[PDB]
C-alpha cells in the first residue's frame, strides 16, 4: 500500500526573487535573456553510455538526463504475440537535486516514466509489431531507462528528448538460430518519427515554455503536450498543485505546438534524420 | 450589492452574492473579486445587510480562545496532559495550571487527571490550543454522560436565547460538540433536523 | 478490434456521442469516515472516505501554513475484468498524484496549518473513467466532511472512437479508441483541476472534445450539487 | 524481517463510557438494546461488485466488508495436482477506521485472512478437488479478496460471512478447448455448505457475542469459533492481549455454537440456499 | 495418507495418545541476550532471546503506562523438510501476533512505562508445535532475564488423528490429522493465553482434547519450573 | 495467614503464601485475592511476619531517588549529558548541576565529561532519572576499573553489615550493578553463588 | 534504492576500558589471557539442526553461528548448464546483539554472505560441476543459510567455519527417475578441502587475530584473509572505517596465514577429515 | 575461456601487464551538486555528486562529534553487457559499504558534528574496476565540494591472468582471470582505504600484485591532482 501527500517546499525561493524572475516577462523575456516561448540551449550526445544498446545524454540548460536502452529476447505476451515490448523507467537520481533521497521511483519519477511511455506508445513512433523476431515465440524487449542526473527544471521534456534520442540511437544485433550476437549490428531500432513533449508553465498572467527550476518553483501549474511532426497531440499531462482556466490550456496548446515544430526540427538535427 | 438566494441549502462553490459587502472573513464563504461562494455544505443566512453560511457538515471543532470545552485526556506528559477536544489540534493542559503551583519532585502519577478522563476546560491560548481549568465547574468529569455531536450543530443544541437548551433541560453543552449530561435521542434528532422547523 | 460507432451513429452501449452514462451518487456511506461518498458513472464505481483535518504525526512532514492532503487512489482486485494485484501499481501511484493535485486547487488547506486531510478512494468496479469517478467521490466526501472547498470538482473523459468525438468513455472505448482525455474542473470557477490525454487527436479534435467535456461536466456538476442537497432539501 | 509490537490505543474510550456499556449487561442487554447473545442487524448484498466473479457486501451493524472473487486458470501445484486453489486476502482499508494507514496487510489483516482461509478450508465447504478442469494440467484458482470498508467491530465474523457469500455468489465461466469464455456462465462455485465464524468477547464477568467497536475497546479478549451447519467446530482463534479461563472458553463455545445455528439460518436466507 | 493410529493403539513415533514427546530445556544459552532459552519438544526446537526492558527509540510508539512487547517468531530456512524462504511469511506474522498476545497476559508490563521488551524467537527445527515451543522458550527467556511475570506459560497442541484425541502432535499428525489445537496457559492462574484450533472436531471432542491438553500442560509446567530452578538447586 | 515455603528457590507464578499479609508492594511478588506468587526467578525469604522474593535474575537496574550510581556518558546534549546507568531509562545530568551555574555562551565541549567517561552520581529525580554530582566523591571516574555485575546481586556484593564488602576490600559498590575498583573473579563468583553459603 | 551511512556506536566502551584491553598487548597477551595470534576456544557441533541437510553450530568464544544447508533440484542457469548452485545467506539475528533490529539482511549481513560466498567459491572447495544430476537439465542448488545467534566479535570467521562445516555435513539424498528420496542418503556434499577466513584487527600498534567484541569496538580496521590448506589466498576483505598502512596488511597476511595452518588443522579435527 | 595473455606477452586490449587504461577526469560536471566529477578508466565510467555538509533530518541517526557519510554506489541498468535490474543488488550494497568506509578515512568528518555528507555514485559504463572508479570520482567530487579531506584516494585493481600479475583489469580479465584485487589508498599518507581480493593468489603473487598496484596508484594520484588543479592553473 501507498499514498500521495502534499510535499514540502524543495526550492523555497525568496519573495524578492519571485519578482525578478517575472519582471521582464512584460518584455517577453526571462531571467536568462530568453523569450517566453524559447527552450534553453539543448545538446544531445548520442552513444554517451557505451555499454547501452542506444543512449543519449540530454543537456537542456542545467537539466541533464541520460537515457539508455538494452534489448532482450523475450516471449511476447500471449495477448500481444505479434509485438515486442517497451518498458520505460525514469529515475530521479539523488545526484540530481539536494532533496532527492535514494530509493525506488517516487510518484514523480513514476509519473514521468508513464507520461514518456504513453507519448512514445500513443505516437506510434515506436511500432512494436516491428520488434518481432518470430511471431508468437520471440520478440525484442526494449528497456528504456531514463536517469535524471541534474534537476534544472522541465525534466519531463528532457526525458522525452533523451528517450527518443536513445531509441533512435539503439543498435539491433544479429539473431542466430535463439541467441543474440553482439559482434554484429544488423540494424537500428525502427522508429516512424521523433516525438517531443512541450511543457508550458503557468506563471502569474504568463505562459512560459520550458520552465527552469526557479520558474517551476513559482508557477501555478504546468501542462505538457506531446507532438509528432504532423503536430498530432499524442499526450497531455497537467501537473502541479494549481489549476488552470480553460483558456490557459487552449493557449498553452497553441504555444506548445508552435514550439514543437522548432523543437522537432532541432531534435532531427541532433538525431541525423 | 445583490444576494442570489433566500434561506437556502448551499454547497461548495455555490454563488451566494455579488458586489462588495463588508463581510468579516468566514471559512464558510470564499470571496473572489466581488463574488461570494459557499465553501461548505450549509444553510445560507442573511443577517441584517450582511450574510453567512451556517455549516450543516463538520466533525471537527475549531479552537477559539475562551471557549468552554470538554475534552478527553489522551496522554499524560512529564509537565502536563494531552487532551482531545475533537479539534484538528490536540489541546494541552499544563499541570502547573491545574495545580496552581510547581510540579514537585516525583509528584503525581494520574491522580488529578488520568488517561480516559473527561475534562471541562477553557481555551486559554490558541493562535496548538493550551487549556486552563482555572474557572469554577472546570475540571475532571466525575459522573454523568458525555454525549458527542457535530461541533457544527452546537448552536442549535443551545438555541437562540437558550430556547433549545431549556426544552431539553426540563424534559452542559460545550463549544466542543460535547455535552455533559432519553437525552441522547433528542440531541441526535436536532443533529439530523437542524435545518428544519 | 470492435466497431465503436455503429451504423446508426451510436455507441456500443447504445449512447449518442454527446451522451453521459447514468450517474448515481450516495453520501454518508460509512460510519467512521468524517465524510464519505459512492460515485457511480455507468459501471465505474468508486467509494471515498475522508478523515480530517487532523494533526500529522510525522510532524517534520507537516506544513506550517497548510494542511497536507494525503490521497490514495486504489483499485480492488475484483474491480477489473482480470484480477488486479492489490499491491499499488504505477498507474495507481500516478493517478493518486494527479487526483491529489486536482484536490489541491479546491480544498482550502490554508485553514488548517500542520494538519493532514486524508482522502482514501477505492475503485470497486472499473469500466473506464475511474480516476475521475474517484476524484468526484473525493470531492463529495470532502463536502460531506464539512471541509471547506473552493468548489466541487466535476469531471469526464472525452475521446475519439472511430474518428468520432465522444463524451464519457466505456472501457471498450478507452481500450480500443484513438483518444481518451479525462478532464476535471471546478466548474463555477472556470478552473481545470485534472487534465490528461492518452492516445492521439488533432488539435481541432482536441478543442472539439474539450468543448464537449465542459458540457458533460456542467451536467455532472448539477447532479453533484443536487446529491449533496438531497438529505437537507 | 518483521516483528509484532504492542499497539497504542486506537479507540481510547472514557472511564465514564465503559460503565455505561456494561451496566445493562445485568439485564442481558447492551448499549444498542440487543441481547448479549445477539448479532447486530445483518444485510448481505450479493453481486455488489459487478466486475467480480462473485461478491457480497456485508453490513453487520456499522461493520462493512466487501468480498469479491476472481477465478483464473492455473497449473495446479505438483503436490496438489487434483485440486484448485483458494487464495484468501483480507485488507483493512484506510477508509475503514481513522488510524488505518495505507500499506500492505498488517498482522491483523493477515491474521484475519488466515483465520478465514482455514475456516473455509478446514470446513471442507469449498472442496478444491471440484475446481479441476483437467487433472494435473489446469485448475481454477479462486482469489478471494475481502476488503473491510467500515471498522465497526467484529470484523472477523463479517469477513467470514462476506467470504462465504462471495464464494456462493461466484460465477463459473465456460472453458473452451485452454481459455475462459466470460459470455457464458456455465455454473456456480460448488460449495458443500456455508460456514460461519462466531466471535465471543470477554467483557468483565460477561460473554458478549458479536462485539461492537466500543465493546472491543473494553474487552479482555475474544475467541472466535467457526461452525458448519452440522455444528462441527472448524476453526478457533483466541485474540487479544488478555487471557481467558478454561471455563470462559468452554462457555464461549457453548454460546458461540448456539448463535451459529441462528447465524447460519440467516446466512442461508441471504444466500438463497 | 499415512495410518496415524496403528493397530496396537499407538502412534507413528510409538507414543500413546496421552503421551508427550521428550522435552529438553536449556537456559542462559546466549551471552548478549538479557535472557535466553532453548526449548525442545521432540524434534521441534526453538531458541529465544530477551532484551529489555529498554527505552523505545520510536518514542511515539512507546506506551505511557506500559512496556511495549516486541515479539518475533521466525523459522530458519533449514528448520523444515523443504527450505522455508527466510523473508517472514504470513504464518510467521500471525504466529508472532498470537505469541505476543500470549505473553501480554503474563509479562508485568505496567512495571516499565515507555520501555520496550524484545522477545526474539527462532525455530531451528520444526516438527509440529513450534509456535508453542517458541512461546515457552520466550516465557523461560523472560524469566531468565529477570523480567517480572504473572506466571510461566506452558503449552501443547492436542488434536485428532484417525478419530483419536492425541496429546502433543507430530508433524505427520499436524499434516495428516483431522484437528490441531495449540493451547497455552498460565497454569497456576487457570488462564489461557494462546488458543487456536485448525482442522475440525465435534464440540465433545473439542472438550475431550481441551481436557487432555491441560494434563500435558501441567507436566510441561513442572519441567519449566524444574528447569529454571536447576542452576540454583 | 500461611506461608508455603522455607528459604526456597522460587520461580514466576510460584505460590508463596495464602492469606492477608500486609506486604508492601514488590515487583517480585504478585498478590491475587489473598494468594501471593513470585513474579521472578528468585529466593523466597521470610522477614519477621512478612516475606519477600530476592530476585536471582535481572540485568537491569531500577532507578531509585538518592541512589549513588556509576554511569557511562553516552551523548553530550546542548544543555547536559545523557548517561547510561544500566537501567531501562537513560539518566540525564544537567550541565548546570555539574557546573553550579549557567551554561555560558559557546561554553564547554566535553572537558568536564566526555562520551565514554564514567560518572559517579546520585539520582536527584525519578518518578527519566535526573542525576546530580553535587555530593563529594561524585564526578568523572579518572582511574581504576569499573566492573559490571547484575544490579540484582549488589546487596550480596556489599553484604549484611558490609561483611562481604570487607572481605573483598582487604584481599566502591554502586546500586547501579557497577563497582569502581583478582577482584573481578571473586565478584563473578558471588554473582554465580549468591544463593549459597 | 538504498544507501550506506556511517553507523552510531553499537558498543561504546569506556575510555578506562580501552586501556585495560590493550595494556597486556606488550606481553603478547589479551584480556582473556590469550595471545595476540590466538583464536578463542572453538567448538563445532555438526548436525545441530536435525532438519537441515547439513549443519554446524559454531561457538568461537561468545560468538555463536548456526549454518544449515538445504539441497534442491533445479534447472541450471543456461550459461552455467554443467554446474549446480550455491546460494549463501547470512543473517545477523536480532537475538545476537541488543541493537540488531529484525529486518532483511543489512549491509553487514550482506557483506558477510558475499565474502563467505566468494571464499567458498574462489577456493574451488565446493566444485559446482560435481553437483550436476543430469547435464543441462537438472542440478543441485545448495542453500547455505548462516544465522548468527550470538554476536561476540569476529562473526565473519565463525561464519566461514560454520559454512564449511555445514557443507561438509551436508547429506545428499537419492534421486529417483525426477524426485529426491530423503529415506536414502546416497552421499555427502563433495568438497575438495576446507577453507578458513582469518581476521586480523588493527588495534593501536598491534595486530590481533580473532578480535572479540571489545577489541572490535576499539580497532582501527580489520582485514580478513581466506586460506585453503595449501595456503593460497582465496579472499581478502578490509573492513571498518579506519585505514591500514601497506605494512599493516603485509604483516596481517603473514600473521593470518600462520594462524590459518592451525585453524585448518583444528577445523579438520572437527570435521573428521 | 579466452586467452588473457597473448603470445606477444600482451593483453586482450593490447596492454602490457604493468600498463594502465586511459584515464579521463572531469570536475564540476553537475549544477546542483555541491561537488561533482566524472571518472573514466578505460571503458569504466562513473559520475559522483556530493551534497553537504548539511543537517541530518533523521536527527537520532546523526552523530554528536562527527558528520555521517551517506554513500551510494549504484549501476545504471545499461552500464553492463546484460541489463542490470535498477533495484540495488547485494553487490551494490556491499560496494556502497566498502566505498563509504574508504571515504571514512579521508573525509575530515569531525569538522561537521551532527551533519550528513552525501556521496552519490553512478556507474554509467561498467568494464571492470567500477567500485574504484566510483571511489575516486567520490574523492574528486568531495574535493570539488570543498569538503576537507586528509588526502585524495587513488585506486586500481591488480590481479592475475594466465598466471601473470596485471595492473588495472579489463572486464574480460575480471571475468576470466584467476585473481582480482582492488586496492585504494591515500597515497601521500601511505594508508590503504579499500582492500579486497576476489579469486586466488599465492602469498608471493599477492605481494607482487600489491607492489604493482602502488605503482599504478601513484600515477592515478598524480592525474587526480593534475585534474583538480586544471581549472585554476
Ligand atoms: Cl480512469
Ligand atoms: Cl506450530
Ligand atoms: Cl569493481
Ligand atoms: Mn527476459
Ligand atoms: Mn456524515
Ligand atoms: Mn495464474
Ligand atoms: Mn543470564
Ligand atoms: Mn527451485
Ligand atoms: Mn563547483
On whether the CB atoms of residues G239 and G111 are closer than 8 A, the answer is: yes
Q: What does residue H209 show for φ and ψ, rounded to 5 degrees?
A: -70, -45
Contact check, Cβ <8 Å, D15/B146: no
Question: Which positions in chain D touch G93 (Cβ < 8 Å)?
Answer: none
Burial G180-213 (b: 16+ CB within 10 A, else e): beeeeeeeebebebbbbbbbbbbbeeebbbbbbb
Question: Which positions in chain H touch F76 (Cβ < 8 Å)?
Answer: 64
User: By CA distance, what is D4's nearest residue in G?
Assistant: G102
Contact check, Cβ <8 Å, B143/D16: yes
Same fold, F58-142 and F143-197: no
Contact check, Cβ <8 Å, C145/B59: yes
Does residue D2 form part of some domain?
Answer: no
Question: Which positions in chain F touch E232 (Cβ < 8 Å)?
Answer: 9, 41, 43, 56, 195
User: By CA distance, what is A91's nearest residue in G?
Assistant: G1
Q: Within an 8 Å CB–CB cutoff, is residue H207 touching chain G?
A: yes
Does residue C3 form part of some domain?
Answer: no
Q: Is the dihedral of CA C90, C93, C99, C104 positive or negative?
A: negative
Question: Which positions in chain D touch A81 (Cβ < 8 Å)?
Answer: none
Question: Which positions in chain C touch B39 (Cβ < 8 Å)?
Answer: 108, 148-150
CA gap C137, C130 in Å, rounded: 10
Grid cell, residue F151, equals 544490579
Is the peptide bond between H53 and the residue preceding it cis, with omega within 30 degrees of 0? Answer: yes
Subunits touching B (CB < 8 Å, at least 3 pairs)? C, D, E, F
Cell 488466515 sits at which residue? D114
Nearest to C217 by CA among C136, C132, C156, C128: C156
Does residue D167 form part of some domain?
Answer: yes
On whether the CB atoms of residues H159 and H171 are closer than 8 A, the answer is: no
Please state, as a whole number, how many other Cβ atoms lie within 10 Å of the Cβ of residue C26.
Answer: 15
On whether the CB atoms of residues C209 and C172 are closer than 8 A, the answer is: no
CATH 2.60.40.790: does it fit domain F1-57?
no
On whether the CB atoms of residues G65 and G52 are closer than 8 A, the answer is: no
User: How many CA within 13 A on the CB side of residue D149?
Assistant: 30
Domain of residue D29: give its range.
14-273
Subunits touching G (CB < 8 Å, at least 3 pairs)? A, D, E, F, H
> Starting from the edge strand earliest in sequence, which strands make up the sheet with B15-18, in order?
B2-3, B15-18, B35-38, B29-32
- How many residues would you count in chain F? 197
Alpha carbon B162 to its chain centroid, in Å, reads 16
Ramachandran sector of residue A85 (left: φ over 0; alpha: ψ -120 to 50; beta: rest) = beta
CA gap F47, F51 in Å, rounded: 5
Residue H81 sits in a domain whose CATH number is 3.30.230.70
Angle A107-122/A155-168 helices, nearest 10 degrees?
50
Nearest to D123 by CA among D3, D231, D258: D231
Q: Look up residue H59 and give its DSSP letter.
A: G
Strands (E), chain H: 23-27, 35-41, 44-55, 68-75, 115-125, 154-161, 164-167, 179-186, 191-199
Is the peptide bond between B165 and the residue preceding it cis, with omega within 30 degrees of 0? Answer: no
Does residue H12 form part of some domain?
Answer: no
Domain count, chain E: 1
Give residue E31 CA to ligand 7 midpoint distance, Å.
Answer: 7
Does residue H123 form part of some domain?
Answer: yes
Question: Which positions in chain E touch G95 (Cβ < 8 Å)?
Answer: 30, 33, 36, 47-49, 120, 122
Does residue E12 form part of some domain?
Answer: no
State which fold the B58-142 domain adopts: OB fold (Dihydrolipoamide Acetyltransferase, E2P) (2.40.50)
Residues with CB in 5 Å of ion ligand 3:
H 130-131
Q: What are the residues facing A226 on neighbouring strands?
A: A197
On whether the CB atoms of residues H138 and H39 are closer than 8 A, the answer is: no
User: How many CA within 13 A on the CB side of residue A239?
Assistant: 25
Q: Within an 8 Å CB–CB cutoff, is residue B117 touching chain D?
A: yes
On whether the CB atoms of residues G178 and G223 are closer than 8 A, the answer is: no
Listed by the residue before each break, gaps in chain A with C–N over 2.5 Å are 177
Is the peptide bond between B38 and the residue preceding it cis, with omega within 30 degrees of 0? Answer: no
Residues with CB in 5 Å of ion ligand 1:
C 130-131
Question: Which positions in chain B touch D20 (Cβ < 8 Å)?
Answer: 145
Question: Which positions in chain E touch G143 (Cβ < 8 Å)?
Answer: 77-78, 83
Grid cell, residue F10, equals 522460587
Subunits touching F (CB < 8 Å, at least 3 pairs)? B, E, G, H
Q: What are the residues facing G44 on neighbouring strands?
A: G58
Helices (H) and strands (E) in chain F, counts: 4, 15
Q: Within an 8 Å CB–CB cutoff, is residue F48 touching chain B?
A: no
Please state, as a whole number, how many other Cβ atoms lie within 10 Å of the Cβ of residue F106.
Answer: 6
Grid cell, residue A107, equals 510518484
Ligand nearest to the CA of C155: 1
Second CATH level (architecture) for the domain B143-197: 2-Layer Sandwich (3.30)
Burial D7-43 (b: 16+ CB within 10 A, else e): eeeeeebbebbbeebbeebeeeebeeebebbbbbebe
Give residue D169 CA to ligand 2 midpoint distance, Å.
Answer: 34
CA gap H210, H191 in Å, rounded: 13
3-state secondary structure string, chain C?
A: CCCCECCCCCECCCCCCCCCCCEEEEECCCCCCCEEEEEEECCEEEEEEEEEEEECCCHHHCCCCCCEEEEEEEECCCCCCCCCCCCCCHHHHHHHHHHHHHHHHHECHHHCCCEEEEEEEEEEECCCCHHHHHHHHHHHHHHHCCCCECCCCEEEEEEEECCEEEECCCHHHHHHCCEEEEEEEEHHHCEEEEEEEEECECHHHHHHHHHHHHHHHHHHHHHHHHHHHCCCC
CB pairs under 8 A between A and D: 10
User: By CA distance, what is A79's nearest residue in D?
Assistant: D179
Please indicate whether chains A and F are in contact, defined as at least 3 beta carbon pairs under 8 Å.
no
On whether the CB atoms of residues E189 and F32 are closer than 8 A, the answer is: yes
Grid cell, residue H155, equals 585506486
CA distances in angstroms from C64 to A13, C61, C148, D92, listed in the order given = 16, 10, 18, 31
CA gap G121, H196 in Å, rounded: 15
Q: Which of G102, G110, G147 to mutate to test the interface with D (most CBs of D within 10 A)?
A: G102
Question: Which positions in chain A touch H100 (Cβ < 8 Å)?
Answer: none
Contact check, Cβ <8 Å, A114/C91: yes
On whether the CB atoms of residues H71 and H99 are closer than 8 A, the answer is: yes
Domain count, chain D: 1
Nearest to F124 by CA among F156, F158, F80, F162: F80
Does residue D273 form part of some domain?
Answer: yes
On whether the CB atoms of residues C25 and C40 are closer than 8 A, the answer is: yes
Contacts of B64 (CB under 8 A, 6+ apart): B123, B126, B175
CA distances in angstroms from C226 to C129, C229, G167, listed in the order given = 21, 5, 74
Q: Domain residue spans in chain B?
A: 1-57, 58-142, 143-197
Grid cell, residue B158, equals 443551545
Q: Which of D1, D5, D90, D107 to mutate to test the interface with E (most CBs of E within 10 A)?
A: D5
Q: Within an 8 Å CB–CB cutoff, is residue A245 touching chain C?
A: yes
Contacts of E150 (CB under 8 A, 6+ apart): E105, E106, E107, E108, E186, E189, F12, F13, F30, F37, F39
CA gap C38, E176 in Å, rounded: 47
Question: Which positions in chain B touch E61 (Cβ < 8 Å)?
Answer: none
Give residue H226 CA to ligand 9 midpoint distance, Å.
Answer: 17
Contact check, Cβ <8 Å, C225/B58: no
Domain of residue E33: give its range.
18-233
Q: What are the residues facing D146 on neighbouring strands?
A: D67, D90
Ligand nearest to the CA of H83: 4
Alpha carbon B50 to its chain centroid, in Å, reads 23
Please state, as a whole number, how many other Cβ atoms lie within 10 Å of the Cβ of residue C210.
Answer: 21
Q: Which of C149, C150, C155, C222 to mutate to test the interface with B (most CBs of B within 10 A)?
A: C149
User: How many CA within 13 A on the CB side of residue D7?
Assistant: 14
CA gap C215, C195 in Å, rounded: 16
Ligand nearest to the CA of H182: 3
Does residue D113 form part of some domain?
Answer: yes
3-state secondary structure string, A145-165?
A: EEEEEECCCCHHHHHHHHHHH
User: By CA distance, what is D18's nearest residue in B?
Assistant: B116
Residue A190 sits in a domain whose CATH number is 3.30.230.70
CA distances in angstroms from D215 to B12, D22, D27, D169, H129, listed in the order given = 38, 9, 16, 32, 64
Contact check, Cβ <8 Å, G3/A102: yes
Amino acid at each position: 500500500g501507498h499514498m500521495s501527500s502534499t510535499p514540502s517546499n524543495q526550492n523555497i525561493i525568496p519573495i524578492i526573487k519571485k519578482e525578478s524572475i517575472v519582471s521582464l516577462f512584460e518584455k517577453g523575456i526571462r531571467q536568462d535573456g530568453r523569450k517566453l516561448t524559447d527552450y534553453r540551449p539543448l545538446s544531445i550526445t548520442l552513444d554517451y553510455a557505451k555499454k547501452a544498446d542506444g543512449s543519449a545524454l540530454v543537456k537542456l540548460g542545467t537539466t541533464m538526463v541520460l537515457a539508455g536502452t538494452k534489448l532482450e529476447i523475450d516471449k511476447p505476451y500471449e495477448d500481444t504475440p505479434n509485438q515486442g515490448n517497451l518498458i520505460v523507467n525514469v529515475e530521479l537520481l539523488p545526484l540530481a537535486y539536494e532533496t532527492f533521497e535514494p530509493g525506488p521511483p517516487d510518484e514523480n519519477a513514476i509519473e514521468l516514466a508513464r507520461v514518456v511511455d504513453r507519448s512514445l506508445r500513443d505516437s506510434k513512433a515506436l511500432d512494436l509489431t516491428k520488434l518481432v523476431i518470430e511471431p508468437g515465440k520471440s520478440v525484442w524487449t526494449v528497456w528504456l531507462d531514463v536517469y535524471v542526473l541534474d534537476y534544472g527544471g522541465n525534466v519531463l521534456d528532457a526525458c522525452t528528448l533523451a528517450s527518443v534520442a536513445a531509441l533512435y540511437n539503439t543498435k539491433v544485433y544479429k539473431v542466430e538460430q535463439i541467441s543474440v550476437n553482439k559482434n554484429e549490428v544488423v540494424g537500428k531500432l525502427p522508429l516512424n518519427y521523433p516525438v517531443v513533449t512541450i511543457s508550458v508553465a503557468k506563471v502569474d498572467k504568463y505562459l512560459v515554455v520550458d520552465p527552469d527550476l526557479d520558474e517551476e518553483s513559482i508557477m501555478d501549474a504546468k501542462i505538457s503536450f506531446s507532438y509528432t511532426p504532423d503536430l498530432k497531440i499524442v499526450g497531455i499531462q497537467k501537473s502541479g498543485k494549481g489549476s488552470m482556466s480553460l483558456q490557459d490550456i487552449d493557449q498553452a496548446e497553441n504555444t506548445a505546438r508552435s514550439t514543437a515544430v522548432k523543437l522537432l526540427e532541432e531534435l532531427k538535427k541532433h538525431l541525423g534524420i | 450589492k445583490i444576494v442570489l438566494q433566500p434561506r437556502s441549502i448551499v454547497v461548495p462553490g455555490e454563488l451566494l452574492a455579488e458586489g462588495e459587502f463588508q463581510i468579516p472573513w468566514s471559512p464558510y464563504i470564499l470571496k473572489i473579486n466581488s463574488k461570494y461562494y459557499s465553501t461548505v455544505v450549509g444553510l445560507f443566512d442573511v443577517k441584517d445587510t450582511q450574510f453567512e453560511v451556517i455549516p450543516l457538515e463538520g466533525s471537527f471543532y475549531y479552537p477559539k480562545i475562551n471557549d468552554i470545552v470538554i475534552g478527553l485526556v489522551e496522554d499524560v506528559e512529564i509537565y502536563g496532559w494531552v487532551v482531545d477536544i475533537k479539534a484538528p489540534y490536540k489541546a494541552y493542559l499544563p499541570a502547573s495550571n491545574l495545580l496552581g503551583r510547581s510540579i514537585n519532585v516525583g509528584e503525581d502519577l494520574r491522580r488529578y487527571l488520568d488517561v480516559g478522563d473527561y475534562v471541562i476546560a477553557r481555551i486559554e491560548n490558541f493562535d496548538d490550543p493550551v487549556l486552563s481549568v482555572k474557572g469554577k465547574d472546570l475540571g475532571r468529569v466525575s459522573n454523568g454522560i458525555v454525549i458527542d455531536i457535530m461541533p457544527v450543530k452546537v448552536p442549535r443544541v443551545i438555541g437562540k436565547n437558550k430556547s433549545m437548551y431549556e426544552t431539553l433541560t426540563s424534559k452542559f453543552v460545550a463549544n466542543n460538540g460535547r455535552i455533559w449530561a432519553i437525552l441522547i435521542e433528542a440531541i441526535r434528532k436536532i443533529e439530523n433536523e437542524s435545518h428544519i422547523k | 478490434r470492435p466497431k465503436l460507432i455503429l451504423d446508426d451513429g451510436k455507441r456500443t452501449d447504445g449512447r449518442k456521442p454527446d451522451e453521459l452514462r447514468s450517474i448515481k451518487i450516495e453520501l454518508g456511506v460509512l460510519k467512521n469516515a468524517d465524510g464519505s461518498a459512492i460515485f457511480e458513472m455507468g459501471n465505474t464505481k468508486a467509494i471515498a472516505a475522508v478523515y480530517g483535518p487532523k494533526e500529522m504525526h510525522p510532524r517534520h512532514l507537516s506544513l506550517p501554513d497548510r494542511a497536507v492532503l494525503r490521497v490514495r487512489y486504489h483499485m480492488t482486485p475484483f474491480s477489473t475484468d482480470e484480477r488486479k494485484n492489490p499491491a499499488p501499481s504505477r498507474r495507481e501511484i500516478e493517478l493518486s498524484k494527479v487526483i491529489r493535485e486536482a484536490l489541491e486547487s479546491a480544498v482550502l488547506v490554508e485553514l488548517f496549518p500542520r494538519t493532514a486531510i486524508d482522502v482514501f478512494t477505492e475503485i470497486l468496479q472499473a469500466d473506464a473513467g475511474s480516476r475521475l469517478v474517484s476524484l468526484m467521490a473525493a470531492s463529495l466526501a470532502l463536502a460531506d466532511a464539512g471541509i471547506p472547498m473552493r468548489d466541487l470538482i466535476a469531471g469526464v473523459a472525452v475521446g475519439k472512437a472511430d474518428g468520432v468525438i465522444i463524451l464519457d468513455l466505456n472501457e471498450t472505448e478507452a481500450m480500443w479508441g484513438e483518444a481518451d482525455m479525462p478532464i476535471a474542473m471546478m466548474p463555477s470557477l472556470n478552473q481545470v483541476t485534472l487534465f490528461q490525454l492518452n492516445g492521439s487527436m488533432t488539435p481541432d479534435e482536441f478543442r472539439q472534445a474539450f468543448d464537449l467535456a465542459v458540457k458533460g461536466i456542467n451536467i455532472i456538476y448539477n447532479l453533484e450539487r443536487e446529491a449533496l442537497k438531497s438529505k437537507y432539501v
